[PDB]
Every structure is written in C-alpha cells, then in structure tokens.
Amino acid sequence: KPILAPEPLVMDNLDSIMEQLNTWNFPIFDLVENIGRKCGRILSQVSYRLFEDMGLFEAFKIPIREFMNYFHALEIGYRDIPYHNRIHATDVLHAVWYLTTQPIPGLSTVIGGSSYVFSKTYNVTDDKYGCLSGNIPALELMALYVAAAMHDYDHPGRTNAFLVATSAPQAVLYNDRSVLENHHAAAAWNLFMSRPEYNFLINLDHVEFKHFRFLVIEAILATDLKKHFDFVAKFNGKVNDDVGIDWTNENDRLLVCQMCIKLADINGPAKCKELHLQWTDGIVNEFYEQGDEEASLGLPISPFMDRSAPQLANLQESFISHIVGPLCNSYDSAGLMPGKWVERKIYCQITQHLLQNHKMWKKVIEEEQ
Amino acid sequence: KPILAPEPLVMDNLDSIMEQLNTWNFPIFDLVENIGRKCGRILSQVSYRLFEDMGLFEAFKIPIREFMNYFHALEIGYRDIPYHNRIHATDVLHAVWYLTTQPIPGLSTVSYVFSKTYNVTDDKYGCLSGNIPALELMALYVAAAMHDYDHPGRTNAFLVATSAPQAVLYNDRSVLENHHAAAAWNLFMSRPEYNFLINLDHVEFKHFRFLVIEAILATDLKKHFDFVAKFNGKVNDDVGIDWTNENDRLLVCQMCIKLADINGPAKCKELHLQWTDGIVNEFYEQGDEEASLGLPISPFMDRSAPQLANLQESFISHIVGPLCNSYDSAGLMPGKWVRKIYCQITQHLLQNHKMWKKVIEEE
Numbered sequence: 187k188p189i190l191a192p193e194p195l196v197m198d199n200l201d202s203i204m205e206q207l208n209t210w211n212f213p214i215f216d217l218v219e220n221i222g223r224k225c226g227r228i229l230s231q232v233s234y235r236l237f238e239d240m241g242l243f244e245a246f247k248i249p250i251r252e253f254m255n256y257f258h259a260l261e262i263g264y265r266d267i268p269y270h271n272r273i274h275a276t277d278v279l280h281a282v283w284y285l286t287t288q289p290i291p292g293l294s295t296v297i298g299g300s301s302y303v304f305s306k307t308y309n310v311t312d313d314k315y316g317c318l319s320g321n322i323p324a325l326e327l328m329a330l331y332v333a334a335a336m337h338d339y340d341h342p343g344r345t346n347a348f349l350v351a352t353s354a355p356q357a358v359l360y361n362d363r364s365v366l367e368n369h370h371a372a373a374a375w376n377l378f379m380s381r382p383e384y385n386f387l388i389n390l391d392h393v394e395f396k397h398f399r400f401l402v403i404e405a406i407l408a409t410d411l412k413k414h415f416d417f418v419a420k421f422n423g424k425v426n427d428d429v430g431i432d433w434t435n436e437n438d439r440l441l442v443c444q445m446c447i448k449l450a451d452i453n454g455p456a457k458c459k460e461l462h463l464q465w466t467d468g469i470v471n472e473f474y475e476q477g478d479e480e481a482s483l484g485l486p487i488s489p490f491m492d493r494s495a496p497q498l499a500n501l502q503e504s505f506i507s508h509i510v511g512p513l514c515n516s517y518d519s520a521g522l523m524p525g526k527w528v529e530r531k532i533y534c535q536i537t538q539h540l541l542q543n544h545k546m547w548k549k550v551i552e553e554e555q
Numbered sequence: 556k557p558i559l560a561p562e563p564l565v566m567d568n569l570d571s572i573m574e575q576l577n578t579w580n581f582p583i584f585d586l587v588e589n590i591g592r593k594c595g596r597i598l599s600q601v602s603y604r605l606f607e608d609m610g611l612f613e614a615f616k617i618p619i620r621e622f623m624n625y626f627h628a629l630e631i632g633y634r635d636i637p638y639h640n641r642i643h644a645t646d647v648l649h650a651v652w653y654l655t656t657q658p659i660p661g662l663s664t665v666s667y668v669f670s671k672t673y674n675v676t677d678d679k680y681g682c683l684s685g686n687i688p689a690l691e692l693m694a695l696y697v698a699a700a701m702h703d704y705d706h707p708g709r710t711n712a713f714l715v716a717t718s719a720p721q722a723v724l725y726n727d728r729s730v731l732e733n734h735h736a737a738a739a740w741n742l743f744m745s746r747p748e749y750n751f752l753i754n755l756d757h758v759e760f761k762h763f764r765f766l767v768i769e770a771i772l773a774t775d776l777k778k779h780f781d782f783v784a785k786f787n788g789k790v791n792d793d794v795g796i797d798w799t800n801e802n803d804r805l806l807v808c809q810m811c812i813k814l815a816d817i818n819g820p821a822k823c824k825e826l827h828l829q830w831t832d833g834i835v836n837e838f839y840e841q842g843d844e845e846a847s848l849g850l851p852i853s854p855f856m857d858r859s860a861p862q863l864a865n866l867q868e869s870f871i872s873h874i875v876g877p878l879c880n881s882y883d884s885a886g887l888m889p890g891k892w893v894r895k896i897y898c899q900i901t902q903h904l905l906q907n908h909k910m911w912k913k914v915i916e917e918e
C-alpha cells in the first residue's frame with residue numbers, strides 16, 4: 187500500500203540543471219525532459235535540493251527517507267492533466283523559494299532574530315539588500331514551502347465554479363466554499379497522516395506541529411482566486427493605512443506568506459516569453475477540456491473556455507491587467523520584490539517580464555481587430 | 556433502499572400538544588413522551604405542522620410525501636446522544652419559527668408568508684415574516700432542522716485536538732457545522748424521493764442552498780462575537796436595519812438561528828434545567844474520552860469535579876446575555892405592550908441568571 191521513494195532516492199545526473207535553480211526563469215520543462223515525462227520525480231527531487239539549500243533538514247532533524255517518501259507519494263497523487271500537475275507544483279515551490287531567499291533592495295533585517303535559515307546562494311554581505319528568510323522564522327518558511335508542494339494535490343482539471351455548478355461530490359462536501367483548496371489541503375494532510383513512513387516532521391513538538399499545520403492550511407486556502415481581491419486589499423491596507431509590515435507580528439508574517447504563495451501560484455505571465463507561453467498552452471488546454479464537458483452537459487460554456495471562440499489574447503491581457511498586475515504592484519509597494527539597485531532606482535526582472543508579456547498580448551489584440 | 560416516511564404521514568394522536576406550538580415554553584418533552592422516546596418522528600411531525608401553519612407547502616408547490624421522506628431520513632440521522640439529538644433540532648426549529656412569526660411590538664411590517672396564529676388587526680405589532688421573503692424564511696427553517704445532523708456529541712476543539720477524520724477533512728475550520736450542512740445536503744441529493752424543492756427554479760434553488768449553508772455555519776460558537784459585533788454595528792449605524800437589503804436580512808436570519816440554537820437559558824426553569832442535564836451529560840462523556848487519552852479534561856467537563864453553576868452563569872453572561880441584548884436592542888424580540896413592553900424571553904433569561912448567581916453565592 188505505501189508509496190515509497192525509489193531506491194536511487196536523490197538522482198545524480200541532474201546536477202547541471204539543478205545548479206540553475208537560483209534563477210527566476212528556471213528551465214523547468216528542460217528538467218521534465220531530463221528526468222522523463224511522467225517519471226513522477228520532479229517535485230521530490232527539487233524539494234530535496236531546496237530543503238538542502240536552506241539547511242532545513244538540519245534545522246528540524248528531518249529524516250531524509252521519510253521526507254522523500256511523503257514527497258513522492260504527494261507527487262504521484264498529482265494527476266496527469268495539462269496544467270495542475272506536479273510540474274506546476276514544482277514551479278510554485280521554486281517561486282516561493284526564489285521570492286523568500288533572493289536579494290531584496292533596501293529590505294531591513296528584523297531586530298532581535300536568533301530562529302532563521304538562509305540559502306547557500308545568499309553569500310552577499312550587503313546592508314543595501316535583505317531577504318524574506320531573514321525576517322520570517324524557519325518554521326513559517328518551511329510551512330510556506332510544504333504548502334506550495336501540497337497546494338494543488340489531486341486537482342481534477344476543473345475550476346471551483348464548475349464543481350459548484352454541477353453539484354460535484356466535492357462541492358457538496360465543502361458546501362461550495364474553496365472546494366478544491368480545501369480538498370488539496372485535506373487530502374495532502376490525510377496522505378501525510380496515513381503512514382509513519384511519511385512522518386518527516388517527527389521532531390517538531392506537539393505545539394510546533396499544530397502551528398505548522400495551521401500555517402500550511404492558511405497558505406493553501408489563500409490560493410482560491412475567488413478571494414484574490416480581498417487579500418490584495420488587506421495587504422494594501424497594512425502598507426497604506428498601517429505602519430507597514432511588522433516583521434515582529436505573526437499575522438503580518440502570515441499575510442506576507444499568503445501574498446507570496448499567491449504570486450508564486452500565478453507567476454507564469456511574469457516569466458520570460460518562452461516559459462509563459464508553455465504555461466499558457468497548459469492552462470488553456472484545461473479550460474477547453476472543461477468547455478467540452480460544459481457543452482455536453484447543456485451548461486453555457488464559461489468565458490475563454492470555448493475552443494471554437496478562444497479569445498486567447500483577451501484572456502491573457504485581462505488576466506494580467508485585473509489579477510497579476512495589481513498583485514505584483516501590491517507586492518512591489520511593500521518593497522518585497524527581488525531586484526537590483528541601478529548604478530535610487532531599482533531594476534526589477536519580475537515586473538519587467540510582466541510588462542513585456544502584457545505588451546506582447548496587446549499587440550495580438552490590435553492585429554486581430 | 557431509501558428511508559421513507561411512515562405511510563400515515565401525519566400522526567393524529569399529538570393534537571393536544573401541537574396546538575401549543577405558538578407558546579415560547581412549548582412542552583417539547585411532553586411531546587417526546589406522547590410520540591415515544593426513540594420513535595424518531597418528532598422532527599418530521601413538527602416540521603409538517605409549522606410548514607402547514609405558514610402555507611409554505613402552497614407557496615412553493617412542495618409535495619408533502621417528498622418533504623416527509625427527507626425530514627424523516629434527516630431525523631433518523633440525528634444520533635441518540637443526550638443533547639445534540641433530533642429533539643434539540645426540533646427545539647431550534649420551533650424557536651426560529653416563534654421568533655419570526657410572533658408579534659413584535661412596534662416593528663414596521665412590509666412574496667411573503669404569515670402564520671395562521673398571527674392576527675393582522677393589531678397595527679402596534681409586526682413580525683419578521685412580514686419583512687423577510689418566504690424563500691429566505693423557508694431557508695432558515697430548513698437550516699434549523701439540518702443544523703446539527705449526525706452530531707457525534709463532541710465539540711470542534713475535541714475533534715481538532717485528536718486529529719479526528721472530520722477535523723482533517725475540513726482543515727480544522729467549523730468542522731461539525733461544515734459536516735452537518737454537507738451531510739444533510741448529500742442526504743437530500745441522494746434520492747429523488749427526497750426532492751421536496753422540485754418546483755424552485757435553478758436560480759431560486761441555488762440561492763436557497765447558499766442561505767441554508769450560511770445559516771448552519773453561523774451556529775459555530777467560535778464566530779459568536781463576530782456576529783454580535785457585526786449586528787450591533789448595523790443597528791447602531793445610520794439608517795439601521797435595511798429590510799430591502801439582502802445582506803441585512805441574512806444577518807437577521809443568522810442572529811435568529813443563533814438565538815434559537817442556545818435558547819435554553821431563556822426558557823422557563825423547567826425546560827432550561829432539562830436541557831442543562833442534556834448538555835452537561837455530553838460534556839462529561841467527552842471528559843471521559845479525554846481522560847481515556849492523555850488529554851487534560853476540558854473546563855466544566857469533569858464529572859468528578861463539576862462547576863455546574865459557574866458553567867451556567869458564565870455561559871449566560873458571556874454568550875447568551877450579549878446575544879439577547881443585541882437582538883432586543885434592534886427591537887426584534889417578541890413581547891407585549893403593557894409605553895412599556897413585557898418581554899417573556901429576556902424575563903426568563905434574567906430569572907435563570909439570578910438563580911445560578913444565588914447558587915454560586917451559597918457556596
């Protein structure tokens with residue numbers, strides 16, 4: 187019955203691609219081909235590297251075998267669908283790691299902090315640059331990373347609105363409230379608890395484990411796009427009406443973690459053209475599969491989900507303008523965006539990609555009109 | 556095989572008690588004895604009478620057989636535990652009906668239904684059923700019937716502390732209330748013999764389901780203070796309660812199902828004390844199980860060390876009292892003009908509070 191991590195445990199010939207993890211535009215699809223399509227190891231392998239990179243194994247006496255057992259079971263439970271698969275989960279984990287360990291221009295380190303981890307890739311001795319992992323305790327950072335790995339577990343390639351409209355068993359079970367996000371969290375925790383071979387958290391005390399579980403759940407549930415505007419408003423409030431992010435306040439740290447996983451979840455439009463376009467193919471393929479089923483069931487086809495009338499450019503442009511753009515703006519306004527001091531001015535790779543990708547789609551719109 | 560209602564759908568031997576439904580201190584335990592303790596028909600029989608009394612069957616072309624099928628299946632699924640049983644569910648349904656149908660002094664009256672027990676000659680009175688559309692009222696009543704379905708006689712905190720499958724399933728968030736709503740809707744949808752809502756259109760049905768869920772989830776005591784604050788907010792704000800606003804009517808409905816859920820301390824001594832025995836018995840059963848494990852026994856749950864009077868007094872002072880005060884302040888409490896108002900409900904709550912204080916002093 188229990189799914190255990192294959193004898194090799196850590197694969198050895200992937201070192202060249204794995205060295206590139208500390209870039210924003212990590213070539214994740216090249217990693218897929220390297221490892222093997224539907225080999226089912228990308229997540230556990232990347233998880234190992236990133237946890238190793240942060241010294242999380244040592245920080246929480248995590249047994250590597252149980253870690254790799256759980257993460258393999260987890261990744262096996264991601265379905266082979268175009269977008270919400272184990273490759274997306276790996277991508278999201280890489281993004282929250284990048285966002286939390288890379289230099290942020292003019293970020294202050296929290297007074298009185300000794301407990302925290304730092305990436306081996308964070309070798310700078312600058313006072314002009316900080317990173318989130320210096321302001322967020324290791325337990326909370328680990329919670330965020332595990333959440334990213336878990337966050338879309340057993341996704342069926344349909345939206346919540348679809349599950350609700352068709353009274354799917356999941357929607358009835360969760361009373362039409364964050365159906366998939368509740369499922370991802372609940373199923374992934376159930377998986378964890380089902381076997382002692384999965385108990386990589388054996389050395390947290392009872393209090394720590396309970397707090398960890400709470401944080402993981404809050405992070406996963408924050409991925410419901412239905413609550414996107416509420417989260418952005420609430421964060422904007424703390425930066426505009428309030429004294430800003432109190433890194434000493436547990437609730438402010440939670441809210442940064444949630445904004446962080448949200449940005450990571452929908453990072454595609456903020457990547458280089460190549461990655462962005464590959465992820466686009468994935469998501470629109472899931473949408474059309476839903477459109478097919480909606481039609482066959484006599485329900486009206488949802489916007490942007492008709493293969494016959496795609497409106498691809500409109501989907502992309504509006505998604506960037508209404509969702510991703512405001513989220514990046516909000517996150518930048520708090521000063522959490524990785525970036526570089528120019529020669530003061532800040533150069534920000536993430537918002538620059540988002541601008542270029544937005545331009546690109548606005549051009550297709552004119553040409554098609 | 557589905558659970559269907561007993562062939563003679565309406566019982567005929569309960570007429571002396573069922574006419575007394577339009578009193579606050581409905582003798583519900585006498586009805587239990589009339590029907591038979593574990594006969595399992597109390598909820599469906601009361602539901603029939605109240606829906607009949609409101610003309611809801613006619614208002615929504617509800618087929619009575621499917622209605623009675625569902626409500627019997629529902630009541631069968633309430634467990635035989637001391638408090639969170641089908642008798643509590645019936646009690647809660649009776650309370651929301653009473654609160655929404657009975658005369659409220661100086662309430663402005665505004666499709667809608669009215670109780671047969673309500674005369675329209677007295678202008679100095681209104682009732683909530685005149686300000687809340689029939690669909691929303693029906694949602695509230697069905698919610699009350701469903702609201703504690705398949706209760707295991709343990710608190711959410713217990714289920715969370717012991718990583719019960721339900722707590723893992725609902726991520727520690729309103730575990731029981733999510734379960735009650737989800738299990739009761741699953742039951743409804745499982746059989747066409749249960750589809751008493753067949754004649755709502757798609758829009759109405761969706762809105763109905765949303766309202767029912769919101770009412771059930773509002774019974775989580777963890778959210779008690781938020782609801783009371785929010786309601787006090789709308790009352791003490793400008794324009795007060797806007798009966799034309801849907802979100803203002805939802806909060807009224809939620810405050811109504813909340814008051815009904817914990818109505819016991821606002822009943823006559825006799826009823827109050829019977830319900831007390833029930834709840835403390837569930838608490839001690841949980842206390843037992845907590846000690847069977849290595850968990851510390853929760854406050855007021857040790858039978859070998861009871862703080863009954865403290866439990867009662869603090870529950871009234873911290874929970875019930877503020878809720879009644881809030882609800883009275885909005886002017887929604889049933890009562891009689893005697894420029895003075897006599898209010899049976901707040902009167903009972905005061906007396907029961909006094910009673911427990913006295914008991915605390917004697918020690």
Ligand SMILES: COc1cc2c(cc1OC)-c1c/c(=N\c3c(C)cc(C)cc3C)n(C)c(=O)n1CC2
Pocket residue numbers: 345346411452453454455465466469489490501502504505508509
């Ligand atoms: C990374 O690329 C993308 C990733 C996603 C989505 C779109 C992407 O690009 C367009 C996406 C969109 C979505 N609904 C929306 C749709 C349809 C269009 C728009 C304009 C806005 C929303 C919220 N809904 C409900 C949804 O589940 N998703 C999945 C995540």
Ligand SMILES: COc1cc2c(cc1OC)-c1c/c(=N\c3c(C)cc(C)cc3C)n(C)c(=O)n1CC2
Pocket residue numbers: 710711776816817818819820830831834854855866867869870873874
């Ligand atoms: C109407 O009678 C009663 C009905 C209930 C409860 C108490 C009653 O009166 C004692 C009750 C109380 C409870 N917790 C509390 C306890 C224990 C004590 C106090 C002071 C306050 C709360 C919120 N919790 C967690 C709980 O589940 N319940 C069940 C509903």
Ligand SMILES: [Mg+2]
Pocket residue numbers: 337338366409
């Ligand atoms: Mg998701």
Ligand SMILES: [Mg+2]
Pocket residue numbers: 702703731732774
């Ligand atoms: Mg309850």
Ligand SMILES: [Mn+2]
Pocket residue numbers: 274278337338409451
């Ligand atoms: Mn995702």
Ligand SMILES: [Mn+2]
Pocket residue numbers: 643647702703774816
């Ligand atoms: Mn109840």
